[PDB]
Write a protein that binds this ligand. Structure first.
Ligand SMILES: Nc1nc(F)nc2c1ncn2[C@@H]1O[C@H](COP(=O)(O)OP(=O)(O)OP(=O)(O)O)[C@@H](O)[C@@H]1O
Ligand SMILES: [Mn+2]
Ligand SMILES: [Mn+2]
Ligand SMILES: [Zn+2]
Length: 382
């Protein structure tokens, strides 16, 4: 990590997409002081960071970034005054007023249903959890809430970010933001809780449509790549999510079967014949769905979305612990996104001078994703 300083110096001088970055956060320049009242937080060397940075224009941002060469850049809220003037403001008047609705998803939050990685590690076997998270959440944001300007970003290490940028979304209060999160959440409980998903008799359309997305990926991700029913050590973790009165019946049919595909098929048949309520003769796949949701449904870092003033790593910032650049994700190629081809700052600095802007490097197609998102914002403003 000692190479970072000179690599960052070249990155911010020749590669960082300043014009596209300002086109984003200036939002057409129609509202006064909108960019000028935006907080930036720079992380420097040795985990030292500065809060409440703000700039007058694109040029002032360029000069300060090329002067500070920060290890990472966080974006905060748009405030009532210039953040760099917040000490001259009378107490109580400095307030966060607007910010994009953001989401942060971390692979670590799935450690209880991951077999391949743990902590901040990721691999192709578990990245499909992010593919499903993007598609489930983005569908809800697009179709259920009518949000039209959504930027998905690779966080650089262990997950993804989403920036919802509709002008009315940026005005939402903390309370409404929490209400949106609650609408989107189904997996509830810490490590103390065994069964984290419970469904009602009547399935809300959001749950049905999310289930059907998971169904497209469940066989190859859960029963092959993860092999969640490989042996007793792992299939007892799934029996913890079903009533005891059917453990015996499932225990035997599992040992008689030979792979997870067969054992899942047996679980579905038993689960759909379990009598949940003795009052009625109503049966269904509720248990089947609760298992699929607990293993695949998106798990949000909820506090990132609730707070208006919460900082989030900027797109095209470096992740200082991996060297990877936080790059936009092509929503039209979400299934093909490979976090392991994401260029590091070292990689693109090498491409630049191998026999001078980002188009000469592997960062170019990621900027094009950002530009497509920017052109849709400009169209909604015309
Ligand atoms: N110490 C922190 N203080 C403040 F004010 N904000 C913080 C601090 N640590 C993270 N954040 C913010 O939370 C966000 C989510 O934290 P997180 O650990 O998830 O970082 P990330 O940028 O999403 O990257 P990875 O998950 O892939 O490791 C960060 O992007 C922001 O910096
Ligand atoms: Mn994260
Ligand atoms: Mn997080
Ligand atoms: Zn993995």
């Amino acid at each position: 990590p000692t190479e970072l300083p000179e690599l960052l110096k070249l990155y911010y001088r020749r590669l960082f997409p300043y014009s596209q970055y300002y086109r984003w956060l200036n939002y057409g320049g129609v509202i006064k002081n909108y960019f000028q009242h935006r907080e930036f937080s720079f992380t420097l060397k040795d985990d030292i960071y500065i809060r409440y940075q703000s700039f007058n224009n694109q040029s002032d941002l360029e000069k300060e970034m090329q002067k500070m060469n920060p290890y990472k850049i966080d974006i905060g809220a748009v405030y009532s005054h210039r953040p760099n003037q917040h000490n001259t403001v009378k107490l109580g008047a400095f307030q966060a007023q607007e910010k994009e609705l953001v989401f942060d998803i971390d692979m670590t939050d799935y450690d209880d249903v991951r077999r391949c990685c743990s902590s901040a590690d990721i691999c192709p076997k578990c990245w499909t959890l992010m593919t499903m998270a993007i598609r489930i959440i983005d569908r809800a944001l697009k179709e259920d809430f009518g949000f039209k300007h959504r930027l998905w970003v690779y966080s650089g290490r262990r997950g993804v970010h989403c920036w919802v940028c509709d002008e009315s979304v940026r005005k939402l209060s903390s309370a409404v933001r929490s209400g949106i999160v609650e609408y989107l959440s189904l997996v509830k409980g810490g490590q103390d809780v065994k069964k984290k998903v419970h469904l009602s008799e009547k399935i809300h359309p959001f749950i049905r449509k999310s289930i059907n997305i998971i169904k497209k990926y469940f066989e190859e991700y859960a029963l092959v790549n993860q092999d969640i029913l490989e042996n007793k050590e792992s299939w007892d973790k799934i029996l913890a999510l079903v009533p005891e009165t059917i453990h015996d019946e499932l225990q035997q049919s599992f040992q008689k079967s030979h792979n997870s595909l067969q054992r899942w098929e047996h679980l579905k048949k038993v689960a759909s014949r379990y009598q949940n309520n003795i009052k009625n003769d109503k049966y269904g796949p509720w248990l089947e769905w609760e298992i699929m949701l607990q293993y695949c449904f998106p798990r949000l870092d909820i506090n990132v979305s609730k707070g208006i003033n919460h900082l989030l790593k900027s797109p095209f910032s470096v992740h200082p612990k991996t060297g990877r650049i936080s790059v936009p994700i092509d929503l039209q190629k979400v299934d093909q996104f490979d976090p392991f081809t994401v260029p590091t700052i070292s990689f693109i600095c090498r491409e630049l001078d191998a026999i001078r802007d980002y188009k000469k490097t592997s960062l170019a197609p990621y900027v094009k994703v950002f530009e497509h998102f920017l052109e849709n914002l400009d169209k909604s403003r015309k």
